Design a protein around this ligand. Structure first.
Ligand SMILES: COCCOCCOCCOc1ccc(C(C)(C)CC(C)(C)C)cc1
Ligand SMILES: COCCOCCOCCOc1ccc(C(C)(C)CC(C)(C)C)cc1
Ligand SMILES: COCCOCCOCCOc1ccc(C(C)(C)CC(C)(C)C)cc1
Ligand SMILES: [Mg+2]
Ligand SMILES: [Mg+2]
Ligand SMILES: [Mg+2]
Lengths: 624, 623, 623
């Protein structure tokens, strides 16, 4: 007689010996409890007498606003199996984090039996701008939650079969763990029709220890394809090609090879994609793999002025649930607002087969902006994208991605997608790139300016080169970078002579803004003077990563800057002649870009159907 | 199968009944734990079920940046012996204290066995500017850590034999405690080849109760010598002399006679010196003996402008770990930066035998600026000094060391080392000493100005007088100070008449700098008028230590000031004639110093091999 | 073998079921302890395994500064008896609250025996400006402190016999409870030779239930004497007379009939009075009876410029140890300084027999300014007064003591004592009383000025009327006050018609000081116009106690003000002619006082020996 029909989200609990900071993602235990809640299994919990455990957490709370805005559901059904005497209280929240009591039931096991069912049904009405639904358990005796989860009162449409896919490149140790975690949960395995791997490196995962057991667990689902290193674009395009050609799944699940999979997130994203009103992309969120209690972002959009991907409104990066729980209205109010996004990353993303077969294959961009363009294309075809809170995987956050080789792909493809979606003349984007070049030159980052000029040149060459540059651009970018001293990395600062500290002045951040202006003037005047070769062989300062800002780099001639991860240093040397030459070349290229932008818009929008075609990608993979 | 090859740092735990604030130096227990962790032994811990214990502490976290910058080690190995069912998560940090989860494991004891081994291996890659490596234990059941420690994956070079040495002076009880603690650890005794003591006081340690048991535990290693009071310089010089002459050890371990020795710190410094790329000095840090949970300084450098020793960059004094643990990124982020130092104190310092035989013996400076000069000499000879975190010893911190007799030895030697490592004319140092003399004369500290003039006069006498002033300057400084009223310490303010509180106005510090300037003007105008003798007999105020600042001593004629430790008072009296005369004499001496500084530089750089030779110190030891 | 000789202070512990906030005066348990410490008796504690208990509390910490400044002791001996396995750590503090570790010992009961002795001896050296000495107990297993206390390493001078004395007036229940508490401790009764009571009321203590048992416990020490109500002055004078005539005790102990006695405080004050360098008055502190975890004052002095009793330097009233313990360096630093006082209250005060026989009897002042004058006379006769921390009793603090009848005795006796100890012409005191009269007239407190004028008149009547006004001033003040509407208390504001709120403007406290000035101007202008009789029958506002300030009372014609304890209201009314006449009379009397001040000084200083004679008080007692 239960209203529960289809499972949407299980009540998952931490692992044996889980760190205390990560436990906040599952349960919010009250400090007044004289005993910590012991998690016997991954779906059961054991709390002692006179204890209160709140499930207003990132994993066990239901985002009712998302299930109201995009799902065909009118109400949700909470079901719990309990043993012992206690009470379960169901609360909801508004768009500003205010707690509202919904219902409450005092439960106890009937004598003669062993367990008791507690069931609530709450409408998705008051969640127009945001809000969650959660439940707290306040025990009178020793209470044990045997099982629980959220349900939809109607059966799930379709079959729900999914084809997973991960592009890998010389990361077999992590791919083995990913496949094992994918095959560990039988509920997830029951929905997987294929597991597609695109090995683009030389160290094949087949030759990795621990691979055969996970492969036997997955059975015939595992399909590994070898191909040249075509980057993330080529890898995910091969995944989608295999899923659309050789598997009969209803949803393609883009994943990454270096993620820690929470298996219930896949089921949550699948159930959300199945109950959607219209076909839509359902992506997952990212938790920091190094700080596992941190949610990296609630959602991402793209500023259409300068055309640049940024955080969605009411979103702040890096949220620590251990320090600021979901109940904290001071620091976690923005988490109670429904976040509307333009795109979602491919670390975990669900694409319906209809959307994939209609809008086509990814663009041959190798890396960067390959997911933003796909999200924008899906939106233009009438398919929105939702970053579903609760469904997430663990992956490393973002370092020197705007300085190293990536600074090439970040710019070129930025100009490509802008050719396909930026409305207007694009002068604001050119001014943004001009000031970015100014900053790069003032910070003694000349290889970045060189490779960005190369990116502008390769972009102005037309879309007909996009498939030729797919496997050969990275080599040229690397060869151009390694000819500048600021790109060659050393083991440590000891490989150079000791810091002389000669001719060093004020290099600390200014306080008042007039000091900022006078230091900018000082830095301009200093960069105008010819440098001293003395500081090109013996560095002046050993500057860390965070101390390497403009107010320090604009007053030096030669400085060792420590890399982001702290594994080495790079010797940046100031050269007025080369700086002026790179600036002149960048301004020439940007003027030509501002002049030819309508032509490039037309050409890229005309070549887009040929770039997303299946035959062109078949020729790219070598299946001619 | 284990990658462990050389023990570098043992996981040590607090003593039975250890104070809670001191326990934070070893373990960081979570407040949500229902039961406090019980340390059965000093090398094992027992935690209850569903508890978490973090080892990101001052004694159980490896300073990976130091073992990357100066050691030949490419990686470290963490080996743990555990009983029960739980999980061990090894983390690291960056230069700003960002916690990076490195690697986790879940352990359980198989049925039929008594314990399990948990081993990790982590490279020393991402530690260019700083960072630690630690591990946390989250228990599912009752979990007992039987043993654990850090291990280098290669064997240790050499033999690891050490010769420890402590100069003592009328402190036999603390020396007996130190000798007992030195021979308490078997792993430490296994590496000690000699224990040299230089008794310079009348109260001999051989006549102290409890000495014979510690002597029998140490064995033939204990070697006690007797010599006149030649200060710390002479004591450590005698220690190094005996070590290089009669012992075949590979390292000399300078220690102090009044320290509480953490035994594993000696082995940590030894392992850090043995795995060094080039020979180097591996000094230890100093924990406050009175506040046993505080670390005094991460390291010390010397500013070459005014030439003065101070805290290294990114170093603040007095860091309480009980209040600000290592995990606190708000108040402990500076402890995650690799601190480069110029020298290290001789409360615990490791000097390789090669370095000692090459650079020589300490200078005959008696007290102050001896370890600084020795570190700078080692640096000039191609040997750096590193203050290794985690390897520390308890000892008192610093009070009146800028007013009492030490103000002599601190200034004179400050000039001596300035004749050796100060590039330039040295006018900045002279201006700094001029303004310091101004501060002293405004604070009615005339004895300090007098002994500083005496220090300048003795420094301008040349290096030939150094060995003559080694056993004779202290008595002269005492006889000079006992002629001033501000240098005579009374038992209490009760020995003087009651405070009159007459003619006492603005003595509380103001809040605006304009008022600071007008009060400085008031004090300048007050130090010009002839003082009233009535206030030189009956004091005006009974001022405590903290209240004795310039905004009070410049508006008074006679005041009793309480000493730093609070065991007495001193009667400071203002005299315009004597103040002006001392100022004139100090200015004349500093003019002569600024004029003759190149001459003194040449004289001290030429006579350096003679003052650091074995024969001169043998003549000084009475040998 | 033990250096302990004389018991100075026992380590006392809370009562069964003691409130948590009161437990902070005895023990400071660590919040991390899994179990709260249980005190099976008042002298034993039982702490569980892995727990820390700090005795740096108000009762179990030794004020080393006071035992160094006023006592002949050179050190203090801490002796404890412990069962179990743990560690004791003795700490001290400086004058600013910095914790300095002194010593530490690990204890464990030897096999066969049941308890072990732990003994420390610490010199009273570094306590010139302040500081305490305490000990912390950190357990390993179950630990039980059976008994402990502080000791002097020399025997106590004299016998230590004390004669107690408590004046009472119609308080039989509290006096019986006080007698029971005084007789409950055998260590206190062993020193008590007499318990003197001066029953000055109609209801006698002899007819109170529960009196016979306390009387039988006290034995023949209880000496009750009946006499007319002569106030506190007469009661304490009769107590001193009886103690000096009919008992052979060494120290008189003034107590109050309505205090909750901590019995060990008496022994602490006695030990401090015996070991003193010179004879001195060792008084005790006052803990708030309504907030038992609060200390009212660390000490009291008297400002000589305007001659008014106030808090001593570095003394803040009302210190809550439950919220701000002694270890809190931010909110309890001032408690770590030695407080020098001018006098001490008579709720608990030890006066040596020599001092009492020499300086004489208290002055016949009825109430107020008697203990101040006695302390000043003692100080003039070379006998200082010291308020000893740790030795305290519980008693009510202070309300309306500046508006009711007490405003009379406080002013008159303020002048009298001034005539004995005020250097100069005393114009500042007259100006202070003038501005106080201005404030009283602004707040519609006309009876206060009406009785202050009577006080100025009776003071100018000469000291020959002091013994005549002893049993007659209270009735005159009462009959004069009850003729004013602001002094007649009503059961509630419901006795008057409801508040009309008519002609009520700005009554909230101004923000910027310019608003304060303009509101003072408005209030001055409002007191110039004729008052409307309408507001004299129906009140305008029902103003609480804390809201009855000048900024509200200076802009009204008739207001009900609630009394301090909240048991009634008074209908204050404004009358411009009456206020003007009271002001004129006050100015006349104050100009006459400022003119005749040297005359009254000479007269009172000449009459003081006759007013403190035994014959005059024998005449006053009816003997
Ligand atoms: C040899 C040729 O002459 C070298 C010295 O003069 C070179 C011109 O100086 C500069 C240096 C930098 C720059 C840029 C373009 C980087 C602009 C600046 C410094 C304002 C950011 C301009 C002129
Ligand atoms: O009377 C003689 C002049 O008085 C003085 C006293 C001291 C001084 C010096 C120079 C020591 C400096 C001062 C006033 C800051 C103390 C000067 C003049
Ligand atoms: C009729 C004038 O009324 C008064 C009443 C009181 C006063 C004094 C002088 C007492 C001062 C005041 C107005 C501040 C109360 C003056 C005029
Ligand atoms: Mg990846
Ligand atoms: Mg020392
Ligand atoms: Mg009373």
């Amino acid at each position: 007689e239960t209203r529960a029909k289809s499972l949407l989200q299980r009540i998952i609990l931490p692992r044996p010996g889980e760190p205390l900071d990560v436990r906040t993602l599952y349960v919010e235990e009250s400090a007044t409890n004289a005993r910590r809640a012991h998690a016997a299994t991954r779906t059961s919990l054991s709390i002692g007498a006179e204890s209160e455990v709140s499930f207003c957490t990132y994993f066990n709370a239901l985002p009712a606003s998302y299930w109201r805005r995009w799902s065909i559901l009118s109400a949700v059904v909470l079901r719990l199996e309990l043993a012992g005497h206690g009470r379960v209280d169901v609360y909801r929240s508004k768009a500003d984090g205010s707690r509202i009591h919904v219902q409450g039931k005092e439960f106890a096991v009937a004598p003669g039996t062993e367990s008791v069912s507690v069931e609530f049904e709450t409408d998705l009405g008051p969640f127009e701008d945001g809000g969650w639904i959660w439940f707290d358990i306040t025990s009178d005796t020793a209470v044990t939650l045997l099982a629980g989860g959220w349900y939809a009162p109607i059966e799930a449409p379709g079959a729900g079969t999914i084809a997973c896919g991960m592009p890998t490149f010389n990361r077999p140790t992590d791919l083995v763990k990913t496949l094992g975690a994918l095959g560990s949960d039988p509920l997830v395995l029951g929905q997987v029709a294929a597991v597609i791997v695109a090995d683009q490196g030389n160290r094949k995962v087949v030759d990795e220890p621990g691979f055969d057991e996970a492969a036997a667990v997955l059975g015939d689902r595992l399909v590994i394809r070898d191909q040249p290193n075509l980057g993330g674009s080529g890898g995910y395009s091969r995944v989608m090609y295999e899923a659309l050609k050789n598997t009969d799944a209803e949803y393609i699940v883009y994943m990454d090879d270096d993620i820690e999979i929470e298996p219930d997130s896949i089921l949550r994203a699948l159930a959300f994609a199945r109950f959607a009103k219209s076909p839509m992309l359902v992506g997952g969120q990212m938790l920091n793999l190094q700080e596992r209690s941190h949610l990296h972002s609630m959602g991402e959009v793209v500023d259409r002025g300068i055309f640049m991907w940024t955080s969605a409104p009411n979103v702040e990066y890096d949220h620590d649930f251990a320090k600021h729980p979901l109940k904290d209205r001071d620091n976690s109010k923005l988490l109670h607002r429904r976040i509307d996004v333009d795109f979602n990353g491919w670390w975990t993303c669900v694409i319906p087969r209809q959307v994939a077969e209609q809008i086509g294959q990814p663009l041959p961009l190798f890396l960067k902006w390959d997911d933003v363009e796909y999200g924008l294309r899906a939106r233009d075809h009438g398919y929105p994208t939702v970053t579903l809170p609760g469904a997430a995987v663990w992956h490393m956050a973002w370092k020197d991605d705007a300085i190293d080789w990536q600074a090439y792909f970040h710019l070129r493809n930025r100009l490509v997608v802008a050719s396909l979606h930026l409305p207007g003349n694009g002068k604001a984007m050119v001014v943004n790139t001009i000031k970015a070049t100014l900053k790069h030159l003032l910070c003694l980052e000349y290889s970045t300016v060189a490779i960005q000029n190369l990116a502008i040149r390769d972009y102005l060459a037309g879309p007909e080169r996009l498939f030729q540059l797919l496997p050969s651009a990275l080599g040229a970018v690397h060869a151009l970078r390694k000819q500048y001293p600021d790109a060659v990395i050393l083991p440590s600062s000891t490989e150079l002579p000791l810091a002389s500290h000669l001719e060093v002045g004020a290099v600390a951040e200014p306080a008042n803004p007039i000091a900022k202006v006078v230091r900018l003037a000082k830095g301009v005047l200093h960069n105008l003077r010819p440098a001293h070769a003395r500081h090109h062989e013996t560095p002046q300062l050993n500057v860390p990563t965070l101390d390497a800002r403009w107010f320090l780099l604009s007053q030096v001639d030669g400085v060792t800057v420590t890399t982001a991860d702290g594994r080495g240093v790079v010797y940046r040397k100031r050269d007025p002649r080369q700086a002026l030459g790179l600036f002149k070349e960048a301004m020439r290229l940007r003027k030509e870009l501002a002049a030819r932008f309508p032509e490039m818009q037309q050409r890229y929008r005309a070549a887009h159907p040929q770039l997303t075609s299946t035959a062109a990608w078949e020729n790219a993979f070598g299946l001619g």
